[PDB]
A and B are shown apart, each in its own frame.
Chain A
Amino acid sequence: KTSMLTKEQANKRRQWYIVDAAGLVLGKLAVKAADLIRGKNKVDFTPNQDCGDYLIIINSDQVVLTGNKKENEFWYHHSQYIGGIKKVSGRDMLKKQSDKLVYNAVKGMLPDNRLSRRWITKVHVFKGDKHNMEAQKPTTLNWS
């Protein structure tokens, strides 16, 4: 029948990365970031335990936005109350803490799993560049 298809035995090793968002578009970078963090790009992806990796984003405020969706695309957040719809533009998020928008964009492609909660906790979206994570000696790579 089979060679008894194998996986890992909770032998996961994860590395830290440094990426700066200054000229890359939202979606086409977010898809690859999600692929990296979920373990999609790995050769021996083991969904049973994990095959993902960590993520740090530096200077998300300088990320580029495309076309008219800056002033045209609007995102809604609903609190469970009457009139809880908060409908804000992409440029509105630029005038605000924009890293959460990228966080939500990445989460939107996350499959409905009991591990996506821990796949997304390894993503640290920062508007700044200086933080305590720089002392962990990340495996520096970017532009995925």
Chain B
Amino acid sequence: MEIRGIFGVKVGMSQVFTTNNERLPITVIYCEPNQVAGVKTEAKDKYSATLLSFDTVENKKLNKPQQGFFEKNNLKPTKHLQEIRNMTGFEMGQQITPQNLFQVGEYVDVSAISKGRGFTGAIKRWNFKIGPLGHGAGYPHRFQGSVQAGRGGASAQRVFKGKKMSGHYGHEKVTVQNLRIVGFDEANMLVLVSGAIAGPEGGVVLIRTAKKKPGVVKPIELAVQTEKA
């Protein structure tokens, strides 16, 4: 189905009390009401898509080619531009409120760059296991043990491409789906999302419609404190 998304910046992590006394973790993301840079139709461009321009900046504060294009296109200079696949139900050059797109109990997915662990070991990157350390266990303490991949011209005598070893973990764009939407704030266009979500508090995070649960909405209400004088 057609994918609907909105971009925002995380500002912190908190929790809220939903109805029936359920403490739900809250990721707080100020969603920027974006203005699409372009729409690629299924006929002229042969595929549905929409490039959105977000994190608005000053024309002087933006680099010459793109800010000049924005001014010629009668748009605003923005820090980032990103295309969203399969979205042509909207028009080009609009100010859109995502309140009409996502509902109080809709299920969405989030694409975000996780916190960068950099060059980390496979002990954490791939979650290897290690048993007893007593009675003599050799030099290493965080290791994988066997890397048996062929000895002698019989079995493999090589090393496998695409193997799961240590390396770059974090600082990568990953998507987590089927998480509940909790809180809306139309005064500043901010969202409160259930669960635990990747993305540093300040970085750019995309929240699009979940394709596993496109029209799966649920009744959600917020348990305001009963202690009122």
Q: For residue B161, which residues in chain A have a CB less than 8 angstroms away from its CB?
A: 80-81
Contact residues, A67-126 vs B (CB, 8 A): 80-82
Task: Write 6 A-B pairs (CB below 8 A) sorted by A numbering.
Answer: A80-B161, A80-B162, A81-B160, A81-B161, A81-B162, A82-B160
A80 to B162, CA, bound (A): 8
Contact residues, A39-80 vs B (CB, 8 A): 80
In the complex, how many residues of chain B place their beta carbon closer than 8 angstroms to a beta carbon of chain A? 3
A58 to B189, CA, bound (A): 54
Q: For residue A81, which residues in chain B have a CB less than 8 angstroms away from its CB?
A: 160-162
A82 to B164, CA, bound (A): 13
A-B pairs under 8 A by CB, number: 6
Q: Which residue of B lies closest to A82 (CB)?
A: B160
Q: Mark B159-191, 1 if CB is under 8 A from A, else 0.
A: 011100000000000000000000000000000
Q: Which residue of A lies closest to B163 (CB)?
A: A81
A81 to B162, CA, bound (A): 7
In the complex, how many residues of chain A place their beta carbon closer than 8 angstroms to a beta carbon of chain B? 3
State the B residues within 8 Å of A (CB). Answer: 160-162
Minimal beta-carbon separation of A22 from chain B (angstroms):
26
Q: For residue A82, which residues in chain B have a CB less than 8 angstroms away from its CB?
A: 160
Q: For residue A80, which residues in chain B have a CB less than 8 angstroms away from its CB?
A: 161-162
Minimal beta-carbon separation of B164 from chain A (angstroms):
12
- Give the 6 A-B residue pairs with the shortest CB-CB distance, closest first: A80-B161, A81-B162, A81-B161, A80-B162, A82-B160, A81-B160
Minimal beta-carbon separation of A140 from chain B (angstroms):
29
A110 to B123, CA, bound (A): 47
Q: For residue B162, which residues in chain A have a CB less than 8 angstroms away from its CB?
A: 80-81
Minimal beta-carbon separation of B166 from chain A (angstroms):
19
Minimal beta-carbon separation of A37 from chain B (angstroms):
30
A81 to B161, CA, bound (A): 7
Minimal beta-carbon separation of A84 from chain B (angstroms):
9
Minimal beta-carbon separation of A83 from chain B (angstroms):
11
A81 to B160, CA, bound (A): 7
A80 to B159, CA, bound (A): 11
Q: For residue B160, which residues in chain A have a CB less than 8 angstroms away from its CB?
A: 81-82
Minimal beta-carbon separation of B170 from chain A (angstroms):
24
A126 to B161, CA, bound (A): 33
A141 to B81, CA, bound (A): 49
Q: Which residue of A lies closest to B161 (CB)?
A: A80
Minimal beta-carbon separation of B76 from chain A (angstroms):
37
Minimal beta-carbon separation of A64 from chain B (angstroms):
29
A87 to B81, CA, bound (A): 40
A80 to B160, CA, bound (A): 8
Minimal beta-carbon separation of B158 from chain A (angstroms):
10
A80 to B158, CA, bound (A): 12
Minimal beta-carbon separation of A82 from chain B (angstroms):
8
Minimal beta-carbon separation of B77 from chain A (angstroms):
36
A81 to B163, CA, bound (A): 9
Minimal beta-carbon separation of A89 from chain B (angstroms):
27
Minimal beta-carbon separation of B160 from chain A (angstroms):
8
Minimal beta-carbon separation of B39 from chain A (angstroms):
26
A80 to B161, CA, bound (A): 7
Minimal beta-carbon separation of A78 from chain B (angstroms):
12
